[PDB]
Design a protein around this ligand. Structure first.
Ligand SMILES: NC(=O)c1cnc2[nH]ccc2c1N[C@@H]1[C@@H]2C[C@@H]3C[C@H]1C[C@@](O)(C3)C2
Length: 269
């Protein structure tokens, strides 16, 4: 996509959270809200940035945030990435404020799997799958964002043992993160139940440089996040399956889609 946004029609509304900001884009001096990501940076962060832009340019799917174009970023001697803006924001902000039923959360889970299967079918890994990077376009439509860490296959509290211990990252490693993301959904991203809160409670906060190693030891011993309240046993077993220590015993996102379809159906009625 070679779409170019002219800086002259861009007015900043707010920062969204690399840095992503919300702009109005209005050439008739009433128009479209857009999210714009901008790259301070130096040590080949620039090449990673070119990677992100090129990855997003090629991805087109209902459950992946839509690429809209680029604009000259004279101030960082780069491009800025222009994306669709989603007003409800990320599930991290939305879920604490609302009380979503199980069937709806399962639908979100299914849609995340669809976007991720698509991504994997493109030979890309995401490496940052967490509730905070899942955006809610409408009450029944989820989109995966934040491709900042995404890579062509040649967040430590969301990472599988092979990532933490060996610095490897498989398709199966994104499936582990999906498991943790699904746990977030079922706890409505309550901070007191969050993966950092729960794992720091076991590890403690006085382990010098060894936090990650301690986390790894607990995972390899088979320690896992608890069953959220009113998560069905079968959904908890699905999560535990996304968390197999051995990467090859995890389901793929392709495996997960028909299962999640079926369970959503069951809880919907
Ligand atoms: N298209 C977008 O990026 C985007 C689109 N609509 C949005 N509405 C509110 C935030 C937001 C977006 N924000 C980003 C998203 C969520 C949060 C903050 C931004 C960086 C983050 O990593 C973490 C991914």
């Amino acid at each position: 996509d070679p779409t170019v946004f002219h800086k002259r029609y861009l007015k900043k509304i707010r920062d969204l959270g690399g840095k992503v900001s919300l702009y109005c884009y209005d050439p008739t001096n009433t128009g479209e809200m857009v999210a714009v990501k901008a790259l301070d940076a130096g040590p080949q962060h620039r090449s990673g940035w070119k990677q992100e832009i090129d990855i997003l340019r090629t991805l087109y799917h209902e459950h992946i945030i839509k690429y809209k174009g680029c604009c000259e970023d004279a101030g960082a001697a780069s491009l800025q990435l222009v994306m669709e803006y989603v007003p409800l924001g990320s599930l991290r902000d939305y879920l604490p404020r609302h009380s979503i039923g199980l069937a709806q959360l399962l639908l979100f889970a299914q849609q995340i799997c669809e976007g991720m299967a698509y991504l994997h079918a493109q030979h890309y890994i995401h490496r940052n799958l967490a509730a905070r990077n899942v955006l809610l376009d409408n009450d029944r439509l989820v989109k995966i964002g934040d491709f900042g860490l995404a890579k062509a296959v040649p967040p430590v509290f969301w990472y599988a043992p092979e990532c933490l211990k060996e610095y490897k990252f498989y398709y199966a490693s994104d499936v582990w993160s999906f498991g943790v993301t699904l746990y977030e959904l079922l706890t409505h991203c309550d901070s007191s139940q969050s993966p950092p809160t729960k794992f720091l409670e076991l590890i403690g906060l006085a382990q010098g440089q060894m936090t990650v190693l301690r986390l790894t030891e607990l995972l390899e011993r088979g320690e896992r996040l608890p069953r959220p309240d009113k998560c069905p046993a079968e959904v908890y077993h699905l999560m535990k399956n996304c968390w197999e220590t051995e990467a090859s015993f995890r389901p793929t996102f392709e495996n997960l889609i028909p299962i999640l379809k079926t369970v959503h159906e069951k809880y919907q009625g």
